[PDB]
Structure formats: structure tokens, C-alpha cells
Design an enzyme around this catalytic site. Structure first.
Site, short mmCIF file in Angstrom:
data_model
loop_
_atom_site.label_atom_id
_atom_site.label_comp_id
_atom_site.label_asym_id
_atom_site.label_seq_id
_atom_site.Cartn_x
_atom_site.Cartn_y
_atom_site.Cartn_z
CG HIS A 124 0.53 34.14 13.82
ND1 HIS A 124 0.99 32.86 13.96
CD2 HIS A 124 -0.78 34.04 13.46
CE1 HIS A 124 0.01 32.01 13.69
NE2 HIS A 124 -1.07 32.70 13.40
CG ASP A 144 -3.67 30.59 12.84
OD1 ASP A 144 -4.87 30.28 12.84
OD2 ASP A 144 -3.12 31.10 13.82
CD1 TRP A 168 -5.15 29.19 20.59
CD2 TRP A 168 -4.81 27.01 20.90
NE1 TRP A 168 -4.46 28.72 19.50
CE2 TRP A 168 -4.24 27.37 19.68
CE3 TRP A 168 -4.70 25.68 21.34
CZ2 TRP A 168 -3.59 26.46 18.86
CZ3 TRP A 168 -4.07 24.76 20.53
CH2 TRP A 168 -3.51 25.16 19.30
CE1 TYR A 175 -9.29 29.87 16.57
CE2 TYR A 175 -7.76 29.16 18.29
CZ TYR A 175 -8.01 29.85 17.12
OH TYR A 175 -6.97 30.52 16.52
NE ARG A 178 -3.09 25.46 15.45
CZ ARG A 178 -1.95 25.20 16.08
NH1 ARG A 178 -1.62 23.95 16.36
NH2 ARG A 178 -1.15 26.19 16.47
#
Ligand code: CA
EC number: 3.8.1.3
Lengths: 290, 297
Positions: A271, A108, A154, A217, A112
Site C-alpha cells: 500500500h 490513501d 473501514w 473513517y 480520497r
């Protein structure tokens, strides 16, 4: 009452120029950094980390601003919570431990950080595993109705402060549990260790931590996207051997455009691969990193 | 202690099969139905409706589920809050007053009701004005990163119950004022009559009303989109003469050039921008009222 879900792991406070990184550290052997994402903390690794600790020095770190890591002051560009900045901070943290070349698995948001790290400083990584992500650019480029509904957060969490912060404060316990449950295969919290859910719940109960998550975010909508865009447009590929794992509930095709040496496999899970499918996730990870 | 913002307008509780529609009713002449959107009520027309009432019988209705209109229980498909259903309910309401052929101006969600009404039942409309919208299909079809950020609420409020409802419940005042403020030109509440704001805030304070709004947005994400999709892919155009007004700083113009879009949806469409944020009848009442009087006359 927060359970120790990594018995035998040390607990390290790693100083960096941007604040402390909290990490559970266990095992011995080559260094392997594990990075969690949203809305979790390092304890999400609690089911796979002991398996990795059989072969690696496992550093299970709270992302900057998450968990028990310090929260660097953000700015109008959300700089400290850009993946580039978090990668730089985690590089600094690993250097504090004398790890300048390490393995990295990210889930997650941590994934990134991880692929941004790989793009910015590929020399720091022996091997990279990313769990259930595509690059941030790809999410925004494929933004359509279906994605917008699916990953509404997002765009919701990226709204200017204090809008998400205020709404999140309307029912934080519900929100974090709703996020955990809705992204599992089961659709409820049964995949998770309740002591781990408590960690996530307590971290999410802190308004400052929630704000950091929004900063993350926000970075994800702006600078992270721009940073990814520059690499897309420059043809910059990740040269570190990498594993892409994803929950069945085409990532390899996507990652092949971002990475020169990528292998991939679906995991029978939603997820939260390391918690919904710890054996399969841990197996794939050891096989890859070994 | 909610203010009467339509002095001399009557009040009608219009029975329909799907619940009562509240409306203020004033004026005389051809019937003109005015539909508000989110997160407002019929009182958003209070600055333009009297001007309209000089020429028209103005019916200023709360949308099904909004304001003081009844709230039909929703279902898995959000059926009563689909614009198709709302349109049929308002058609029923208008029939109760003996208006089987009427003019219609809608803003925001009410403009979505309005163009869906015109697609489903064009014979009910003499003329149609939609204020600061594109069709729901067009917003979803243009939902890229920039637009997903701009109208995040389209995807946020469409999340399955009770996620938006639970977050909205913590501080409803903040959210309704945030949305009112953020879509204006100024970015604050200064364009609104504070008495109107109180109406919006009180409506939003009701958890059932908030749920209805989410149902509206859920319908907007699903059935409304599907209904629009069928029309656009079948080449179905609104045949009712229509006026598309949008705010130069409104939401519609952020997705695309609104007249170009509406000409794909409507065979007889004129357009004008109004220097305004999203809330044309309150930010730009004179210009809105003049555009509408001119079009409907
Ligand atoms: Ca609650």
C-alpha cells in the site's frame, strides 16, 4: 525526538477557516500538493518529495486533523473530516499560498480528499495522482466477505464513538505498527524509515488524533460515500488528467469510470507506494506531472 | 463470588477428547442442550432454563473454549473453534451423559454450532432451535456496506492474532459491556441480570478466553463459512425440525428476512420473531421460554 525528513524544506503553518494546516514546503516551480493518508502523516512523502522538489514547489501537507495540522471540532455528521470538507480546507490552505491551480498527489485518505477535490473543484487542479485507492463508493459497493476482512478497519473505525477510540487506546503503538506492516509487501516495518515510523507512532499516540482518524473513517462510511454516490448516479467524471498508481500487492478499469483522462500503472509494492517503492513512485509522478 | 443463576441445577464437568465442557444440568425428561453465544456463557439461559427444566432435562453448556469449558489450543485453521469441531465436541459431551439423540437450542455462536451440528450429524438431533442467527454463510454473503457496519465485529474479531486480542486487552470490560448493550433492544445493560453480566465480564476478563472468542470469529470468517458454503452450494438442508426465533431488533433480521433464509437451509423450519434485541432469552425470557417449550414439546 522527531527527525526532519525533508532537509531543505520549509515548515509552514497555513491558516484556514477550519484551523491550521501544517506543511513542509520545498522546491520551486509549479505547485504540487502531496497528501498522505492513514495512519501516516506528511512525512510518508519524505522519500519521493525531494525528487519532486527538483521540478515543483512541493507542499507536503498534514491532512486536517492529522499530524501537526489543527483538529477542527467534528460534529454528528463528521463534516470536517468528510473528504469534501477536507478538500475545501486544503483549497483554502493553498489559496493562502497563492496557489489556486495546482497539481495534487494523494495517497490513501489524502487520495480520497484528492479525487473528491477533483470532483468538487476540478478547476483547482492541473493534474491529479491518486496512490493505491479506488473511490470510497467503490470500496463500499464491492463490500463482500473478502473486502470486509481485508479492509475491516473501514467498518471498525466507522463504529460510533467511543468504541474504536477505546479499542485503539488498548494498544495504539501496536495498532499503528500493525497497520503499517500488514499493508506492506514485506509484511513488516522494514520498508519504512524508522524515523518516519516514529512520526506515525507519535501522531497515533495522541487520543485526539486517533479520534480524528475515526472521524475520517466515519465520514468515509457515511457522507463521503453519499457524496461519491451522487457523482456516480449523476455520471460526474473527474475531468482533470489523472494518474492512478497502485501497489501490485483492476484500479485503472475502476478509475476509468470515474475519470475521463486516467492513466495508471502498478507499482511493485504494498500500500505504501512512496515508502516501499520511492524510486518507481517518484519516477511515475514526475513523468506524469511534468 | 459469581452468582449461581440456576438454583437446583447440578453442575457437570463433561470430559471430551477436546477438553471438558462445563454445564449446568437440571430438570428431567427429554434431553435439551442449550448453547450460548458471544460474549456470553451458559448463564444467559438462566431465565429460560428453569421453565425448560419443568419439561426437559436441560443441559446448559459452556461452548468449547467459553465460560468454564476447557480451551483447546487453536491452530492455523482455528479448527477447535469451528462450529463443526465444537459440534463434534458437544456431541461427544452429550454421549458422555448418554444423550445420543437430543433437542438443541442455540443462541448466537451456539446457534451456529447447532445448525452445523444438524448439518453434520442430523441423527443426533430430535429438534433444533436457533435464536437470532442466520447461517454464517448468509451473513457473509449479505455483507454489504450497511451490514459490514452493523456487524463490523465479524470482520474485526476475525483479524489475525494478535490484533483484536491486543485491542481488546486494553479495557476488556468496556468491550464486553459494549457488545452486550449494543445488541439489546434498549441499547443498554438493563435487560440483563447484573449477576449474569458479572459472569460475562469475568469470562471476558481472561485473555485466553478473549483469544478463543477471536478464534471463534476467525473460524466464522474462514472454515465456518467454507463449511456452510459447501452445504448451501450442494443444496444440503437441515432435515431436523427446526425453530428459528429472532429478535425484531436483533442481528439476524438486519441481514434479511430470517424465515425466508432458513427455509433455504432447512426442510422443516418454523419461525417467529420475538420483540427483542439479539439476546432473546434475557431480553424476552418469557416469550423465548414459551416458544421453546411449545416447539420442543
Ligand atoms: Ca499490548
Amino acid at each position: 525526538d522527531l527527525a526532519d525528513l525533508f532537509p531543505g524544506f520549509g515548515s509552514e503553518w497555513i491558516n484556514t477557516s477550519s484551523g491550521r494546516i501544517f506543511a513542509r514546503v520545498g522546491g520551486d516551480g509549479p505547485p504540487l500538493l502531496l497528501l498522505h493518508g492513514f495512519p501516516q502523516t506528511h512525512v510518508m512523502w519524505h522519500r519521493v518529495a525531494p525528487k519532486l522538489a527538483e521540478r515543483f514547489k512541493v507542499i507536503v501537507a498534514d491532512l486536517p486533523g492529522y499530524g501537526w495540522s489543527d483538529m477542527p471540532e467534528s460534529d454528528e455528521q463528521h463534516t470536517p473530516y468528510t473528504k469534501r470538507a477536507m478538500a475545501k480546507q486544503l483549497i483554502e490552505a493553498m489559496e493562502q499560498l497563492g496557489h489556486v491551480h495546482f497539481a495534487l498527489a494523494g495517497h490513501d485518505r489524502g487520495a480520497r480528499v484528492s479525487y473528491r477535490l477533483a470532483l468538487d473543484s476540478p478547476g483547482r487542479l492541473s493534474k491529479l495522482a491518486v496512490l493505491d485507492i479506488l473511490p470510497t463508493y467503490e470500496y463500499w459497493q464491492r463490500m463482500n466477505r473478502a473486502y470486509a476482512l481485508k479492509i475491516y478497519h473501514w467498518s471498525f473505525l466507522a463504529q460510533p464513538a467511543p468504541l474504536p477510540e477505546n479499542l485503539l487506546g488498548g494498544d495504539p503503538d501496536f495498532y499503528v505498527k500493525a497497520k503499517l506492516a500488514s499493508w506492506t509487501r514485506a509484511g513488516d516495518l522494514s520498508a519504512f524509515d524508522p524515523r518516519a515510523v516514529e512520526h506515525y507512532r507519535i501522531a497515533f499516540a495522541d487520543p485526539m488524533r486517533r479520534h480524528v482518524m475515526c472521524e475520517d473513517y466515519r465520514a468515509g462510511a457515511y457522507a463521503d460515500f453519499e457524496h461519491d454516490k451522487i457523482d456516480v448516479e449523476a455520471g460526474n467524471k473527474i475531468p482533470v488528467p489523472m494518474l492512478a498508481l497502485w501497489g501490485a500487492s483492476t484500479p485503472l478499469d475502476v478509475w476509468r469510470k470515474w475519470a475521463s483522462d486516467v492513466q495508471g500503472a502498478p507499482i511493485e509494492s504494498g500500500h505504501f507506494l512512496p515508502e516501499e517503492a520511492p524510486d518507481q513512485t517518484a519516477e511515475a509522478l514526475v513523468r506524469f506531472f511534468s
